[PDB]
From a paper:
TATA box-binding protein (TBP) is a key protein that facilitates transcription of ribosomal RNAs (rRNAs), messenger RNAs (mRNAs), and transfer RNAs (tRNAs) by the three eukaryotic RNA polymerases: Pol I, Pol II and Pol III, respectively. The concave hydrophobic surface of TBP interacts with the minor groove of the DNA, whereas the highly charged convex surface mediates binding with diverse transcription regulators. A group of nuclear transport receptors, collectively termed karyopherin-β (Kap-β) in yeast, facilitates active nucleo-cytoplasmic transport. In previous studies we showed that Kap114p, a Kap-β that mediates nuclear import of yeast TBP (yTBP), modulates yTBP-dependent transcription.
Ultimately, a cryo-EM structure of the Kap114•yTBPC complex, representing a ~130 kDa heterodimeric protein complex, was determined to an average resolution of 4.03 Å using 212,899 particles. In the Kap114•yTBPC complex, Kap114p is arranged into a right-handed superhelix and forms a 1:1 stoichiometric complex with yTBPC. Notably, Kap114p mainly wraps around the pseudosymmetric N-terminal lobe of yTBPC, primarily via three binding patches (the B α-helix and loop of HEAT8, the B α-helix of HEAT13, and the α-helix of the HEAT19 loop; highlighted by light blue, light green and light orange in Fig. 1c–e). A short α-helix in the Kap114p HEAT19 loop binds to the hydrophobic concave surface of yTBPC in a similar way to the TAF N-terminal domain (TAND) of TAF1 and a latch region of Mot121,24. Residue Y939 of Kap114p interacts with yTBPC Q158, just as F23 of TAF1-TAND1 binds to Q158 of yTBP and F123 of Mot1 binds to Q116 of EcTBP. Residues Y933 of Kap114p and F99 of yTBPC facilitate hydrophobic interactions, comparable to those of Mot1 F129 to EcTBP F57/F74 and TAF1-TAND1 Y19 to yTBP F99/F116. Among these five residues, R90 and N91, located near the α-helix 1 of yTBPC, are bound by the HEAT8 loop of Kap114p and exhibit close contacts with the HEAT8 loop via residues S369 and Y370. The other three signature residues—R137, R141 and K145—are located at α-helix 2 of yTBPC and interact with the HEAT8 loop and HEAT13B. In particular, the double mutant combining Y370A on Kap114p and N91A on yTBPC resulted in a Kd value of ~1.5 μM for the complex, i.e., more than a thousand-fold weaker than wild type. Hence, Kap114p binding does not induce substantial conformational changes in yTBPC, consistent with our understanding of how other TBP-associated factors promote TBP remodeling as a consequence of binding without changing the TBP structure.
Numbering used by the authors:
A (entry chain B): 63 to 235
B (entry chain A): 4 to 11, 16 to 74, 83 to 291, 302 to 564, 567 to 846, 872 to 899, 932 to 941, 957 to 1001
The structure:
Amino acid sequence: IVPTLQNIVATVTLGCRLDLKTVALHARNAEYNPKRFAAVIMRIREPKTTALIFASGKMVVTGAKSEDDSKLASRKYARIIQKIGFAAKFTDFKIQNIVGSCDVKFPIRLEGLAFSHGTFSSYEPELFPGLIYRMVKPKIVLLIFVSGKIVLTGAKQREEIYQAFEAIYPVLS
Amino acid sequence: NELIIGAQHTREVAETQLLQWCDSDASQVFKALANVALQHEASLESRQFALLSLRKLITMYWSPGFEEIDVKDFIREVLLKLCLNDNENTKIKNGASYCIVQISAVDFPDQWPQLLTVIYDAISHQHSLNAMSLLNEIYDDVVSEEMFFEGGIGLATMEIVFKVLNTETSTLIAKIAALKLLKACLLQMSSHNEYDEASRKSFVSQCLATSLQILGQLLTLNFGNVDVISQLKFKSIIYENLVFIKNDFSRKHFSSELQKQFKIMAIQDLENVTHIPLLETVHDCSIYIVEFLTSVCTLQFSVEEMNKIITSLTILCQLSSETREIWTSDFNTFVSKETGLAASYNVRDQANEFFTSLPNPQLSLIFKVVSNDIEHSTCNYSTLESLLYLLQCILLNDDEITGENIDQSLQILIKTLENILVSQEIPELILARAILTIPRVLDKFIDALPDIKPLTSAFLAKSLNLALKSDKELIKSATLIAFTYYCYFAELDSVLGPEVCSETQEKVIRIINQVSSDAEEDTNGALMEVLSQVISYNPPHSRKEILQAEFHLVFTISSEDPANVQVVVQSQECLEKLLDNINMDNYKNYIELCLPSFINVLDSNNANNYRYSPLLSLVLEFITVFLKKKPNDGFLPDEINQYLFEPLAKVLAFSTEDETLQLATEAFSYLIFNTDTRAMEPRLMDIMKVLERLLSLEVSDSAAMNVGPLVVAIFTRFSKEIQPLIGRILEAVVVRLIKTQNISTEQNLLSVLCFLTCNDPKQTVDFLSSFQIDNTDALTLVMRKWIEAFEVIRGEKRIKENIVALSNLFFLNDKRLQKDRYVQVPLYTKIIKLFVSELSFQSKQPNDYDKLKEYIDGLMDVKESVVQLLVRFFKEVASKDVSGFHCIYETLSDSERKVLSE
């Protein structure tokens, strides 16, 4: 079972510095409240995402359920701010990391599976449910829950998530 | 007065006399000006015009940022009565208030902190409507969290607000600006949520708790039917406060019982507003209502409550007659809206946001309810128009929807939707929304519907054929958007036959031709975005008619709208997805297909001397992309060069603008790299002219940045005819290097020297030494500059090649190189200690809304690390003391010579 990407982080370097206020002035569906999360939030009709336009010019966007959708969205954000009295060349798009989720839906005896790793697997269920794991090839954080849900973060493309899923799958099985 | 009359373009020159007088004794000028507006022996408009003069008068001298006590005090004192006088007309008080705000935001605390005492006196004792709203405005100007609590000001403000909201005798108009004052207050509350302090946090929490019940009683209050319009404004402001409380403050500060009460009360008010500048007033009021309903989406809802919301919104989201007219007379805006490019955000625009955040069961029940609400409304059309936009809204929500009655309601709904298309009397807008929304229904229930697969083809055929026949292109103007959504989840290329896929393509291509023909710069994106997703669906076999089309589509479309950004990027993206799965055999026909169009761009721009044009840059990008997309096997067939060198050659030659020269240079270098050698050497001299000019005073350092890749590309072909022109290359490169003042570009330039000394060190040093620039040897300054390059060198990647270069350099045994504090020492001595020190350092090993801000935050590859090459070098040279290294090693300091062995 390939694990669905539940979120994506994408970043881009819009060509120029921007004035947050103008954006909040012109498009004005951006809530800009300095000194609390000091960068403008924007959201659009489709796909559903938030995006932090920074005055300094760079940008992050999250909400896409696919690499292609994350692109398509960041493009729209670039287009919109461009209509706001600025020039920006959509460049250097990249996906610093994603997060992928999939639930096996059947608890397993994870006590011994934790000891199987020991140095990697840290397990304190009373503090908080789940189990934090590191997989070598490549580096990626895994959350493995007695409930059955597996979360993964740190990847850059779908292949990393799929291969980490499959690599840790028999161990938990 | 008379001078004010003259000052208030002949008036512009007349006020120059006032400006000249102000140049003298600005301090005294201020009070003299203030007297004019003060005095009643002046036309009220003239007094306002004096006010508006005071704006620019203050900035130049009164505000040091641009760069008398009684005089400034007199201005404020006069304004006290003048601005706040009810008998004054709105314009006069507003002009005065602008002076208040300018002077306050820059000088209020030091000059006059008690201004606030005057304001409380006015707003409390006199109930001055102007005073309270003016205070609200000034709030942001100086009201700091520190001054809010430690200044104690916030306390006086809040208590004034509660006092006023207690006075039922006070007019609705008073309470409006009071509520706006309340929001102004809430903003200071906003930031304190993350970090809390006992004293102020307690007062803040008490303020919130008090405010909530005041707002509740205000909700319960009703106003006279004689004045309904103001009530709407009065109502709207109330709700906006609500939302800022919920979405900005921790749950603890808002209770579930409060949320339920406000939910029911807001729904009832929404219904009443539904039942009633008038229309825009109602409609703007409704938006904050719906936004709160969203922010309390978590709370359960009754089926009757859900029907209330549906039958109310479906009336709210009816577009006016004039908007129908706009999108009928101009559909180019329509897409700007639909793809979220518009600025306008109406109820129709906020409801779509609403239904997304609902959890599953509420969403599913709402879906069920609207399912029947649709069939009930099929007769009246605009009802179905808006209700279908709303159905899209739920459908957009990612969560699944499940229902045993939902299944059959869905079959009936699909039958109704097809009825929409088959009928020929349907209004334009509703059919466009139906085309744009059916794919949402398909996506939401893709798994649910057993007949989904043939149904996808059936709907695509129906909708697209419909998109052939439309005297009005709005139907088509929406079908293209709908096609992206279709391709969101419809693996039609896999499902449908390659002939079926290609015919659907040619179908859309003709649709895009028709629509594009009149497309507005707002839309070019969406069109070409569909173009891309169509491209990705092309089927070894190559059908050149469709591919020729799709290309010319790409380029025509981009032509009119180069400056826009999504057009640029999706264009390049399209272009790349044509050049997939292309071998040298197929690659020919692409040569002829593509190069002529690009060539003609540059040729046309030649009339503009290759001065930057967005289409120019866009084409240079396209050709870089084509270049890169060559099939791995083989080289670049010459005819490609035959076409590409002379236009790109003149591109470089004539142009001087950095970024355009760069966008060319990259393709230039890449071409010259992949090209077969034998074609180049006739072009060698021309390439030398190019590399020279790129390394020349005329061109800036930014241009010189990307000369490098070309350099290595030159060697990649051969060296035989390179050597006689080496000396020329070296002279040009060094003369460019000396004048450069970009440290990044300077580092890049020095990065070139690796291969230059890799092929031969003797000619390099001999020529550079021999050459004199203004009877001055370039070698000495080159070595010094290289030293400073070290002093700021960043990136070990360049360093590894620097070691390869130094292996060539050290054995030259150049005698001249052997021959506050400033390091002026012979090179052979110097370099050894620097690299030994770098090695010594390397011996010592150096090793979610918050997280996003942190998510922001050479020529050759050498597998051997620094240590291996350095140790073998030092073993071979220190023992053999090559190039006067005996003196250097024997006089070497032992501070890090012992650390060397590590």
